[PDB]
Design a protein that fits this description.
- Chains A, B, C, D: Keywords: Calcium, Isomerase, Metal-binding.
- The structure is cut from a larger assembly and holds four copies of chain A (359 residues).
- Chain A is an alpha/beta fold and 359 residues long.
- Chain A folds into two domains: 127 residues, Enolase-like, N-terminal domain (Enolase-like, domain 1, 2-Layer Sandwich), CATH 3.30.390.10; 230 residues, TIM Barrel (Alpha-Beta Barrel), CATH 3.20.20.120.
- Chain A is 37% helix and 20% strand.
- In chain A, the strands form two sheets. In chain A, strands 4, 5, 6, 7, 8, 9, 10 and 11 form an eight-stranded mixed sheet that branches.
- In chain A, α2 packs antiparallel against α3, α3 crosses α10 and α7 runs parallel beside α8.
- Chains in contact: A-B, A-C, A-D, B-C, C-D.
- The interface between A and C is large, with 42 and 43 residues.
- The complex binds calcium ion (8 copies) and nickel (II) ion (2 copies).
Chain lengths: 359, 359, 359, 359
């Protein structure tokens, strides 16, 4: 018969980062994470993690995961049914925001558990195969001089053929100087993406984008606030560079309304906000219908399991917040990433967890 | 290690039908089926079947399945990857029509095999659970007087709370007489659906639908030709009764274009034409985004395995063409249908297959 | 000289409710609230409260309010600037959901402190006057027989000329019987509103609304999920009854996108989710441009201060969660509510707080 | 304890101007103003002024201000309520045009009185702070040769980083030669705006704007008549330079229709035509929803109090008609303008008023 959930625990950690990532709104210089364990009555504990953005989110997210989780004891391990139940539970309060991250975190852990119980990676459960997905190396604001060694190692050693950096921290001249430097340093055969992290308004985005058009950029990411779907659509209409967005939209319905608005050319759901594996698969069918190339936002380990069954799969984003607390950290080979199992391939390095844990 | 396909065989049968199903275009008085077996190297053979509509399609379908199957020998049993390969293979010739039915038939048999290999129903592989799905009993043209015994049995014994019949064979008076008779016999608490089988043009469909709105119909199905998405949309715009369609549209893209045109209020894909299980799941995401209740068209055994994971699941259509040749025929309990495994719950009663096989 | 914030504290309480409020998704039989205090350097502490929906949200919300407030300590008490600050702080994480309720709770407390500092009700600070706003009495599921006495009291003692109840818990017959009984009991000159609390899909909402059209309802509230803007709009297009929504949308952009999609005929923002007073005022300008009548969702004490400066002000919803812990609980006179100051008129009954506090 | 209005008086003056402002329709070489005084019963007199465009409007505006004011005797000083009363009073006759300017002038004086009564600048009453707003220096037709000294002072001494000039007075070659000369004199890092003052039709606007594309203009202002919203939208859709407009539109509804038509990329309401402070606040909500950057049209003293609470605040226009008759004339520092109080910071230099008064 089917495994049942027996308990749920969540722990907060703050991991270190070598590359401090400056963005238009400030700097992320550590990895605040929430580590989720779903125990079963069949000798398996499912695992997933959330990137929490800021230390302030950790305590609330832990309360949520554990309080939602407690009510799941005794329930059959059936992700689709569990997702429907969480939907009903939070219908009135709202599942956008921290609640939805807890819900998506739990979903990933349920699927990880199912994978473990079967001795297979999640990607095989989903009817696909674990194969190399094109990846890009995701940075904060870069400087072609100061960061040359790092970028050399990325492209030469790890084989990356795509790099993303950040802009909107200053004026247009600052963005242009950065991109011009990068394009000169990396040459014409490396893809370059630019992420504004929601920092512009539509008129200013249109203006900057037109002035960056000569650097052969692959996409412009979140040019304006994520909630501003109409403003994204306006920028998209006038842009000669594809518009990428989605990492901050909530659940399959959030994607359905963005697509209805025509907000972007590309999407990149975040597994923590799209409703975990279950919600991702829904959106994959939406993106196929809309002919929208679909990439992932961080959570590279889990994202590697869903991109191979995504009809319009595009890029996997490499930004490694969790490696320090994982038994088997992400590996990039020849600029690509392959899913690792069983489950999602998330098992904790407990000595490191103990070191970086916070309460 | 993942199973590989070793071979594919297809057999044609014509099963007997208790009651002839008269429609606007003719009569279906038997069940021309293609039974598909996909042998693997792990002691399991995946099964699925196609309803072929007419005996004329049997030989061509057998050939196509065997020809395509032969080319898949040695390949890993990975439904998503196999579907992508079949897509590329038929991109130029086209996979609408008989080729598409072959392709979808193969896909169902692959998932069936995965389920058998796991010892689980396909629905559990898909992250859902096998649970009772509301069903309706699907008839040809009915006559309340002549068909009372059958309808009493359907409602009183099998617990059906919804009945579908056919229209468009004659004039509007004929349709109205039929429906009025049925509604008087069955009372207000049984759902009634009406299927025109593509027999009207948009102006006539609009005219008939307005005159039938007093009988509290649940839906009007395929009022005009299935290819006529614009015509469906025009009927839908003017109709006070929900418009149902989709059993004849091809693959996830066929649904994406229909939805983009606003062809219908409800949809009911056929697993044989939507791209099997793999195609169905894509369309389930689209239907959720469009807020379109999604039902099934025939193939009730396999349909029972995908409706439980379909966000907008509506009705399962019960029309039993295959019962005669299955080891475990479809069961209806209290007007609902529950998925049976392992796999899709499709294993052949060989003595019956021998009896009804045509060559 | 402008006051500065010196600290922020939040306390959780669960207040008793005389009458349970059954809705389509469950029952609210208590008032889990978060009471917010913002101390200033000018002898005034600003107050606001949040209705938290479920006890599960209380600890995380208290954490968020205190943690955000800690970071505002030392800033000038300038609500427009503080809101810009909070926007930038949560731009990446997201301010939908619990975070947004904390942000809006803080905003209301800032304006409450300003009013206290001036010795004026907030409404006069906003260039308006404290004057009676039409109100309706907001119930759970009602039964005209069982609840005759309560409704008589509401109409005769408090002068209500409008009543709202809930539906969608069961089938259409149940909704119709409830509304039919209420219209028969109350007669044609009492306004009746029906709230589905997001429980239907668009097709089913359209079907039920058409059947309820003869009861002369004032509005149908949240017929489908709040996130489903395109779905609301599809319902609105087909509905002969005005569609009301908004109590679950986030900040002025959430309203801008809903209005752009044509989701509803009426709106009713919740001060906890629209961005407090500061967010409300922005939406008031949007609703004026769109000619959308604008009512409030709960928080009647604070809502009384903003409706008098809302160009399209419609109704104030009376649902009294907080009276138990207020020094001056809400009063309804002749079916209307008048704003009370100074500030928002929220000061705590500390003995009651001590009684109902939960930790 | 709310102040009541006791009387209203208005005086006409014609102030001298340093240099003529030539535009496509004529020359403004003086400042015909209406100075408005609202006396209250609490020892404060509210002040505002109108720019009247032409001496012909002075007598009628004085008449209207005094006649309307006379009917406000004894009314409570509540701007939102007074605006609604003025709306009802002029609904039939119409409040577009001279009546609307008198109405908006009164509103500004009411807010100024409230700020004076509180001992605070209006911006602080509105929940914002007095902070520097980026400004541009607003000229008539310029010649880079003849006007070099004036423009060097503007950019070097006063720190302006943005300059606006007028076009449409002759043919396209004239506009182009002028812009070319200005761009050469000012260099790349000074913003340049061009105001056609409604002098073109849409086809001619489209033709001229395309020819001015290479001069890096910030905006093209009122390319066609202000009432021609459809014509503005057509220019906007074809224009590669942002279209600015709005200085001549009437009240929040005038903006709502222009925004609904998609008339412009940017707007710049005139406090005299938008409905004073009260109407400006409504339109600020609209511009936020539409993501439209919002600047001011003249009345720089009062505009400095509302731009700080305008979510999409863009530029403050510096054109100083009133400095001659103010106790504290506008000050520009480092190309920015900061609100001064109390009230709107408008108090009259009575000896100057006497010198420039016309009767
Ligand atoms: Ca990003
Ligand atoms: Ca584009
Ligand atoms: Ca059919
Ligand atoms: Ca229709
Ligand atoms: Ca409600
Ligand atoms: Ca309607
Ligand atoms: Ca102008
Ligand atoms: Ca344009
Ligand atoms: Ni805690
Ligand atoms: Ni006169």
């Amino acid at each position: 018969t089917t495994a049942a959930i027996t308990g749920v625990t969540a722990r907060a950690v703050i991991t270190p980062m070598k590359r401090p990532l400056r963005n238009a709104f400030g700097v992320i210089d550590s990895g605040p994470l929430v580590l989720i364990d779903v125990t079963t009555d069949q000798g398996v504990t499912g695992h997933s993690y959330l990137f929490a953005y800021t230390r302030l989110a950790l305590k609330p997210l832990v309360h949520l995961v554990e309080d939602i989780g407690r009510e799941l004891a005794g329930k059959a391990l059936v992700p689709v049914d569990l997702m429907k139940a969480m939907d009903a539970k939070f219908r009135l309060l709202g599942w956008q925001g921290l609640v939805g991250m807890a819900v998506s975190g739990l979903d990933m852990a349920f699927w990880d558990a199912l994978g473990q119980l079967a001795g297979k990676p999640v990607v095989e459960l989903l009817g696909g195969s674990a194969r190399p997905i094109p990846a890009y190396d995701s940075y904060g604001v870069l400087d072609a001089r100061d960061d040359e060694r790092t970028l050399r190692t990325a492209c030469d050693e790890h084989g990356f053929r795509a790099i993303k950096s950040k802009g909107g921290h200053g004026d247009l001249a600052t963005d242009e100087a950065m991109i011009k430097g990068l394009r000169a340093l990396l040459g014409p055969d490396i893809a370059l993406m630019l992420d504004f992290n929601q920092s512009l308004d539509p008129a200013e985005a249109t203006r900057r984008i037109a002035r960056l058009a000569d650097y052969d950029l692959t996409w412009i990411e979140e040019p304006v606030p994520q909630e501003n779907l109409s403003g994204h659509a306006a920028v998209r209409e006038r842009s000669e560079i594809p518009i990428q967005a989605g990492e901050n939209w909530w659940f399959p319905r959030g994607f359905a309304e963005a697509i209805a608005a025509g907000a972007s050319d590309f999407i990149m759901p975040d597994l923590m906000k799209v409703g975990g594996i279950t919600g991702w698969l829904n959106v994959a069918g939406q993106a196929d219908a809309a002919s929208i190339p679909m990439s992932s936002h961080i959570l590279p380990e889990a994202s590697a399991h869903v991109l191979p069954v995504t009809p319009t799969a595009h890029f996997l984003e490499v930004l490694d917040f969790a490696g320090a607390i994982l038994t088997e950290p992400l590996r990039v080979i020849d600029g690509k990433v392959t899913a690792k199992g069983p489950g999602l391939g998330l098992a904790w390095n407990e000595s490191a967890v103990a070191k970086y844990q916070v309460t």
